[PDB]
């Protein structure tokens, strides 16, 4: 689960090319890739 004001950043950019929004885009990318990094092995752990 991702929170509010968390995918709305990942859809479009309400600003025009700001660095803090690059940091704010690389944070949500990680908060959405990390859970995948766990659930891709979780259904291997189910076999254990």
């Amino acid at each position: 689960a991702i929170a509010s004001e968390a995918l709305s950043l990942l859809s479009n950019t309400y600003v025009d090319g700001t660095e803090i929004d690059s940091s704010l885009r690389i944070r949500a990318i990680q908060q959405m890739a990390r859970n995948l990094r766990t659930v891709l092995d979780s259904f291997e752990r189910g076999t254990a």
Partner: peptide, 22 residues
Amino acid sequence: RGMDDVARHLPVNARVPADLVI
């Protein structure tokens, strides 16, 4: 502390006389 190696993203050994136990 450094901030520089993170702001880019977004020798010798002497012997001792000791008492070794495992």
